[PDB]
């Protein structure tokens, strides 16, 4: 399902 | 603000982002794309404390968006409502990922039988599984029986629906499966040649076929004693097939 969101900034 | 109350306080501030697309395709039998578009929406499940101000960011590998319509809270920045809401709808046409290629082959045999072989090529990273695969092969009206054999999956000839249905649970990227049929025909008015419907597909791929990726979703609450590094964030991509037809 949902996977983590690593910051791309 | 009339869409979000005040004094919302959550212990664990989580963030769920569903990006949902329906890839549509009409393709000639030889492989030429005759039409294609993606319709997408981005729904956001928010559990953040207070009245947070968020910036949502993505690749506008980038993407063209041919049209947008936002939630009333946008200005890409916004104060999101609590719970689940739809942040934006979009539609794209250029540089779509076509997650399957359908490759039809039809051999006439006298006026009696029809030899038919259809190949699925799956076109995405092999680390990813397409799911709920179905391939509809239309059979003529004057068919007495049909014989099929399939390697991957199971296939039944729904004669009521007048179409072979081939169903496949999983399939990984950069692979290919195929199905072969023999269709026994009754005699009929040779006046009317048969108006050959296209082959239909349905599938679920764990990625946006518009190539959309979420770069950042940043949360800023000034008053309350938390910051962006504190929010648990999650994103899922879900590509369904709308109308996915390969001609002939």
DSSP for chain B reads: --SS-S----SS-EEEEEEEEEEEEEE-TTS-EEEEEEEEEEEEEEE-SSS-EEEEEE-------SEEEE-TTB--EE-PPSEEEEEEEEEE-SS----EEEEEEEEEETTTEEEEEEEEEE-S-TTSEEEEEEEEEE--SSEEEEEEEESSSEEEEETTTTEEEEEEEEEESSEEEEEEEEEEEPP--TTS----PPEEEEEEESS-TT---EEEEEEE-SSSS--GGG-EEEEEEEEEEEEEEE--
Binding site annotation covers B154?
yes
Instruction: Set out the domains of chain B in order of their start, with CATH numbers.
Output: 14-96+207-243 (2.60.40.1170), 100-203 (2.60.40.1170)
Binding site annotation covers B158?
yes
- What residue of A is the nearest CA neighbor of B238? A1
A9:B16 CB<8 A: no
Chain B: closest CA distance from residue A7 (Å): 6
B208 part of contact set with chain A, CB < 8 Å: no
B101 part of contact set with chain A, CB < 8 Å: no
Burial (CB < 10 A; 0-12, 13-18, 19+), residue B198, is: buried
């Amino acid at each position: 399902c949902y996977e983590q969101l690593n910051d791309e900034e | 603000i009339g869409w979000r109350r005040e004094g919302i306080k959550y212990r664990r501030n989580e963030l769920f982002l569903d990006v949902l697309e329906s890839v549509n395709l009409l393709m000639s039998p030889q492989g030429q794309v005759l039409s294609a578009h993606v319709s997408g929406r981005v729904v956001m499940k928010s559990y953040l404390s207070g009245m947070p101000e968020c910036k949502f960011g993505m690749n506008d590998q980038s993407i063209a968006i041919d049209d947008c319509t936002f939630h009333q809270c946008v200005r890409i920045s916004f104060i999101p409502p609590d719970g689940e809401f739809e942040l934006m709808r979009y539609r794209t046409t250029k540089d779509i990922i076509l997650p399957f290629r359908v490759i039809p082959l039809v051999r006439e045999v006298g006026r009696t039988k029809l030899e038919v072989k259809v190949v699925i090529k799956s076109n995405f990273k092999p680390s990813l599984l397409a799911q709920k695969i179905e391939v509809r092969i239309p059979t003529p009206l004057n068919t007495s029986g049909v014989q099929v054999i399939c390697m991957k999956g199971k296939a039944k000839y729904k004669a009521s629906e007048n179409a072979i249905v081939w169903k496949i649970k999983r399939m990984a990227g950069m692979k290919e499966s195929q199905i072969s049929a023999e269709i026994e025909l009754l005699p009929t008015n040779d006046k009317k040649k048969w108006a050959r419907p296209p082959i239909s597909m349905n599938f679920e791929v764990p990625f946006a076929p518009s190539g959309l990726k979420v770069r950042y979703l940043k949360v800023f609450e000034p008053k309350l004693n938390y910051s962006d590094h504190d929010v648990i964030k999650w994103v899922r991509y879900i590509g369904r097939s709308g109308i996915y037809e390969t001609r002939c």
